[PDB]
Amino acid sequence: KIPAAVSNWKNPNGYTVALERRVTINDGFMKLSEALENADKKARQ
């Protein structure tokens, strides 16, 4: 069964369609931010 094609760009016949049809972080970032935070602490102290 092929679904009905609803485009987000086109509406040839002007159909008002149901709205719903018209509608993890890598660890390196943590390590980078932690290292920079420690470097800042070193500078302060």
């Binding site: 092929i2 679904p3 094609a5 485009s7 987000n8 760009w9």
Partner: protein, 48 residues
């Protein structure tokens, strides 16, 4: 079954091409996997 199904399928093709140009991920829920492969095949050739 041909008469209406063809006009439906090629609308999915054209939508896939629009998604490719927009860099939107084309993914139609309940699309059959082989027809999905066929459409992506022709979209990739047009893209190239």
């Amino acid at each position: 079954i041909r008469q209406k199904k063809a006009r439906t399928i090629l609308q999915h093709l054209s939508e896939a091409w629009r998604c490719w140009k927009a860099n939107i991920p084309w993914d139609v829920p309940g699309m059959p996997a082989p027809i999905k492969k066929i459409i992506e095949r022709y979209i990739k050739s047009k893209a190239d």
